[PDB]
Amino acid sequence: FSIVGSLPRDC
Amino acid sequence: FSIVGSLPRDC
Amino acid sequence: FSIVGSLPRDC
Amino acid sequence: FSIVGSLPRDC
Amino acid sequence: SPFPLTSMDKAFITVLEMTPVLGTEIINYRDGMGRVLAQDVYAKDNLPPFPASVKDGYAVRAADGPGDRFIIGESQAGEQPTQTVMPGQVMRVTTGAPIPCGADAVVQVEDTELIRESDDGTEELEVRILVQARPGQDIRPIGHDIKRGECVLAKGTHMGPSEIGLLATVGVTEVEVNKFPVVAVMSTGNELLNPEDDLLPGKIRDSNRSTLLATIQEHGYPTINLGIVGDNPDDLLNALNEGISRADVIITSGGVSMGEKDYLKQVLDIDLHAQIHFGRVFMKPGLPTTFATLDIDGVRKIIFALPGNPVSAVVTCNLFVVPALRKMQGILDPRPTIIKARLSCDVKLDPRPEYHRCILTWHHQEPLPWAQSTGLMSMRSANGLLMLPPKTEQYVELHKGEVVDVMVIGRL
Amino acid sequence: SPFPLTSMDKAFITVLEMTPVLGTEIINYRDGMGRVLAQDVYAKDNLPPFPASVKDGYAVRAADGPGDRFIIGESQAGEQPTQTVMPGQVMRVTTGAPIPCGADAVVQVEDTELIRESDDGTEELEVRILVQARPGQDIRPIGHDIKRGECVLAKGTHMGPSEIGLLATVGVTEVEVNKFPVVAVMSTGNELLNPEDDLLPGKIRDSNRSTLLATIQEHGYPTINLGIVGDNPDDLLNALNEGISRADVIITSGGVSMGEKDYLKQVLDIDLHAQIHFGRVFMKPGLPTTFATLDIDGVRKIIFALPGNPVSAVVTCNLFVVPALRKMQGILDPRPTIIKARLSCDVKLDPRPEYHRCILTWHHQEPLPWAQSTGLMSMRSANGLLMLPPKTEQYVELHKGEVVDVMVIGRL
Ligand SMILES: Nc1ncnc2c1ncn2[C@@H]1O[C@H](COP(=O)(O)OP(=O)(O)O)[C@@H](O)[C@H]1O
Ligand SMILES: Nc1ncnc2c1ncn2[C@@H]1O[C@H](COP(=O)(O)OP(=O)(O)O)[C@@H](O)[C@H]1O
Ligand SMILES: *C1=CC(=O)N(c2ccc(N3C(=O)C=C(*)C3=O)cc2)C1=O
Ligand SMILES: *C1=CC(=O)N(c2ccc(N3C(=O)C=C(*)C3=O)cc2)C1=O
Ligand SMILES: [Mg+2]
Ligand SMILES: [Mg+2]
Ligand SMILES: [Mg+2]
Ligand SMILES: [Mg+2]
């Protein structure tokens, strides 16, 4: 778990 | 809008 | 049917 | 790579 | 002249509406690959034509139930059995062998135990049936797969290996199909040399003829090489007359823009008396693409005058020419297959609908393929044509990962 | 005998590991479709080989800026210009024509207005240049597209029309490629008649030979028809020796199960002295599928003894045979293309991985295609093979709409 927003996984 | 649950649209 | 490419939907 | 069909994921 | 800008969608429906369907001919079934049937095909025999064993085992009487049985002999593949199975008897059977008279079920060898064989060990004599056979168990009755008088293939069927195999199965070895178009290709330009030539001052090699002929041959159609024709009306008229004589379809490239020595449109209209349906298309690449028909003695010839730019020539050949040829060889819906793919790269949109060769690749388990524009990836040939939408106020750019239409032009 | 059940994944990697890559030969570039280059290919010339106009317009001096110009003549496609453009002069140019000495930019005709032409109207004499040309504007410099000494195609490239066109462009008309496999097909069984025959008691027509030959021919490989061979060791050995003599690959169908007169495995091992790598595969259909190699004088022959059931024979031909042939003709990654599709119908899973011919269809704008099992849809030939997973405690059934792997076997 992360409180930091992720990037779109496959792109 | 409907208070009745829909079915999956394309299937 | 179109021989012309469509724009991306839900966008 | 597998020549055997996979099971559906997120399921 | 200058001809109106035709919308891409109008140009495309015009080609399909005005292209004819060729007449029929009888062919040998082994030549049927990619052909379209112009007749219904009927079975004249039952499949199977005799009751056939589904299994290696024994033909039994179900009413005997389990127990010990005398083996009266074997039903061999390709031989009508001459014995009748009586109560307490069985006959060996193999897969596809006829069921002898007297037997009404098959018990597979795994549901049996051998009691006694010959001294030589070449002959089974007595067997224990361990199960109660269901009536008709593991028998294909006469006509189970195909009945005499059944229609096994409909007119309009676009045949592959399995259809050829069905023709073989029912013994219909001669079939009515649509003819394939014969397609003549010529290059135009005083600047062009043959691929076999060393360069001379001011000249380049002709690549379009090779690329277009290969594109047509890939789809299975016969071709005629009309060579390189100079930029002059008389020569162009002579080449076009040879193409009309020898072929159903004539493809030219070059000499369709508004340049000083671009003469093809004048020759098609004034000299050849063809009907030019469009002479410019609002598309990128392929602005000067020209489509004409010529009716001679109730035969419609079709003429595609493609642009000289090599990239334009192959792209427009894929968009306009291949669907026309599909229609001429009898394919009921000649439209290309269009799939959804993800852009591998940001791209700027043009006011014109835009087309580019690409490679389609499916990644591990992601549902949609990636489209990588061709403009280790170099080990594979283009199998798609990116179909990019005309820009709008909303959209001036498409981003890596966005879902786009890709026309299939290749066969993995 | 009975041979161990080989996993589908082990069987498949075994075929690819043990199949050889054929040797090379020189071909004419026009015969290059589907071939794999066994050499790097180099340009010996620049493209363009002269500075070329991108446009119909005028070759100018950018330093002249806008204004009124004398037209000293025309640079014609296919002709080296003999004049030098001096200040206040221009020369007409067309797309692909050489830039004359003295000029350093092209201005397209739309950025000009004609001042004066000949009385005949056949000759432009004076023109107004309305724009300030950027230096080198609308000129393709020498070698812009291809440089002399550049590698334009790498060894390992699987060629389509565009690669043929590139060979034409650089004038490399003879190229080293891998050979195509020559593939011999025979049917086996005393019950089989030719497709041309009327039925006789106990007999059916041979369909597998037609279906398998058509399947191989569809991929572009030369074939040899070895006919129908009876269920007897001597005849089978004679047919197999003819196939080894005439071909790189031998395909049989029938006679591989554990039936009384199923003899192919004995003949391959004892008589022919081939190495059988697997004789049963845990798969549906295709349990008895057999793969063998035979090394003679440092040449590896490959033998596929497919099952007799027509559906099994075509399915196993698509799974095992076609990838092997792709490897033999030099394709670096011979694995088939596998896509994601939606099941059109609920299906029960088997303990074995299961395969079925289907048709792939893309619907309006839905991203994924539908797979409809073949077991108006009848107008099209199978283009996919459904790849269904082995059942588990979790999964005994798959539902309409679920995403499944489909192997591409057809070319839209
Ligand atoms: N060439 C063929 N065309 C059509 N049906 C065939 C062909 N070869 C075999 N069959 C049928 O397939 C079934 C299995 O044949 P068989 O030789 O026992 O195959 P296997 O031993 O590999 O299972 C039988 O019903 C047989 O008649
Ligand atoms: N067969 C061909 N092979 C390669 N390049 C070609 C061929 N035909 C034309 N070209 C080039 O394409 C460009 C446009 O040729 P052109 O005859 O003016 O086409 P169009 O008038 O249709 O635009 C020029 O640079 C020309 O040299
Ligand atoms: C991955 C990177 C990226 O930029 N991206 C993406 C997806 C989708 C869009 N879309 C639009 O711009 C408009 C609709 C839309 O879906 C932009 C960028 C990725 O998926
Ligand atoms: C449409 C009808 C239907 O039944 N259906 C569907 C989709 C997905 C699933 N899935 C599973 O059974 C397991 C995973 C999964 O996605 C079942 C049924 C439709 O999409
Ligand atoms: Mg030209
Ligand atoms: Mg031109
Ligand atoms: Mg047999
Ligand atoms: Mg058998």
Task: Please tell me if residue A3 touches chain E, with a CB cutoff of 8 Å.
Answer: no
Identify the three-state secondary structure at position F50: coil
Q: Do E9 and C2 touch (CB under 8 A)?
A: yes
Task: Please tell me if residue C6 touches chain E, with a CB cutoff of 8 Å.
Answer: yes
Structure tokens at F54: 């991108």
Among C2, C5, C11, beta carbon nearest to E388: C5
Q: Do F400 and B10 touch (CB under 8 A)?
A: no
Ordered alpha helix ranges (H), F69-225: 161-170, 208-218
Does ligand 1 lie within 6 Å of residue F279's CB atom?
no
Read out DSSP for F389-407?
PPP-SS-SEE-TT-EEEEE
Identify the three-state secondary structure at position F346: coil
CATH placement of domain F48-145? 2.170.190.11
Structure tokens at D11: 């399921």
Atom 7 of ligand 1, nearest CA residue:
F308
Which residue type, as a one-letter code, is found at position E311?
V
Resolution of this deposited model, Å: 2.0
Question: F 344-383 residues with CB below 8 A of B?
Answer: 363, 366
Beta-strand relationship, F275-278 and F290-296: antiparallel
Distance CA F295, CA F299 (A): 5
Does ligand 1 lie within 6 Å of residue F293's CB atom?
no
CB atoms under 10 Å from CB of F135, counted, come to 10
Per-chain residues with Cβ under 5 A from ion ligand 6: E 257, 259, 262; F 95
Distance CA F107, CA F139 (A): 10
* Whether E209 contacts E216, CB under 8 Å: no
Find out if CATH 3.30.70.270 is the number for domain F338-412.
no
Task: Please tell me if residue E401 touches chain A, with a CB cutoff of 8 Å.
Answer: yes
DSSP bridge pairs for E118:
none
DSSP bridge pairs for F178:
F24
Q: Do F211 and E76 touch (CB under 8 A)?
A: no
Identify the three-state secondary structure at position F121: coil
**What are chain C's partners, defined as 3 or more CB pairs within 8 angstroms?**
E
- Report CA(E8)–ligand 6 centroid distance (Å): 21
Q: What are phi and psi of F169, to 5 degrees?
A: -55, -45
Q: What class, spelled out in words, does domain E24-47+146-179 have in CATH?
A: alpha beta
What residue has token string 């593949």? E77
CA proximity to E392, closest of E353, E355, E351: E351
Distance CA E288, CA F110 (A): 16
Q: Where in chain F is the domain with CATH 3.90.105.10?
A: 24-47+146-179
Beta-strand relationship, F370-373 and F338-343: parallel
Q: List the determination method.
A: X-ray
CA proximity to F193, closest of E301, E95, E323, E47: E47
Q: F125: Cβ–Cβ under 8 A, 6 or more apart, which residues?
A: F70, F71, F115, F116, F117, F118
Shortest distance between the Cα of F400 and any Cα of chain B, in A, equals 7
Q: Which CATH architecture has domain E1-23+180-337?
A: 3-Layer(aba) Sandwich (3.40)
Q: F285: Cβ–Cβ under 8 A, 6 or more apart, which residues?
A: F307, F309, F311, F312, F315, F316, F355
First to last CA, chain F: 42
Rounded to an integer, what is the distance from CA E306 to the centroid of its chain?
Answer: 24
CA angle in degrees (0–180, nearest 5) for F130-F136-F141: 140
Among C2, C4, C8, beta carbon nearest to E403: C8
Distance CA F41, CA E303 (A): 35
From chain E, pick out residues whose CB is under 8 angstroms from the CB of C4: 8-9, 353, 387, 389-390
Read out DSSP for F247-264?
-SEEEEES--SSSTT--H
For residue C5, the number of C-alpha atoms closer than 13 Å in the C-beta half-sphere is: 32
Angle between helices F161-170 and E208-218 (to 10 degrees): 160
Atom 24 of ligand 1, nearest CA residue:
E96
SS (H, E, C) chain E: CCCCEEEHHHHHHHHHHHCCCCCEEEEEHHHCCCCEECCCEECCCCECCCCEECCCEEEECHHHCCEEEEEEEEECCCCCCCCECCCCEEEEECCCCECCECCCEEEEHHHEEEEEECCCCCCEEEEEECCCCCCCCCEECCCCCECCCCEEECCCCECCHHHHHHHHHHCCCEEEEECCCCEEEEEECCCEECCCCCCCCCCEECCHHHHHHHHHHHCCCCEEEEEEECCCHHHHHHHHHHHHHHCCEEEEECCCCCCCCCCHHHHHHHHCCCEEEECEEECECCCCCEEEEEEECCEEEEEEEECCCHHHHHHHHHHHHHHHHHHHCCCCCCCCCEEEEEECCCEECCCCCEEEEEEEECCCCCCCCEEEECCCHHHCCCCEEEEECCCCCCCCEECCCCEEEEEECCCC
Q: What are phi and psi of F32, to 5 degrees?
A: -80, -5
Angle between helices E161-170 and F208-218 (to 10 degrees): 160
Distance CA E92, CA E125 (A): 10
CA proximity to F85, closest of F67, F105, F110, F68: F105
Task: Give kind and range of the element (H or E) at residue F10.
Answer: helix F8-18
Task: Please tell me if residue B10 touches chain F, with a CB cutoff of 8 Å.
Answer: yes
Distance CA F326, CA F12 (A): 13
What residue has token string 């080296």? F80
- Taking the CA atoms of E51, E57, E59 and E62 in sequence, report the sign of the dihedral they define: negative
* Whether E47 contacts E143, CB under 8 Å: yes
Q: Where in chain F is the domain with CATH 2.170.190.11?
A: 48-145
CB atoms under 10 Å from CB of E366, counted, come to 13
Distance CA F326, CA F158 (A): 10
Shortest distance between the Cα of A6 and any Cα of chain E, in A, equals 16
Q: Where in chain F is the domain with CATH 3.40.980.10?
A: 1-23+180-337
Distance CA E357, CA E341 (A): 13
From chain F, pick out residues whose CB is under 8 angstroms from the CB of D7: 389, 392, 394-395
Atom 15 of ligand 3, nearest CA residue:
C11
* Whether E183 contacts E247, CB under 8 Å: yes
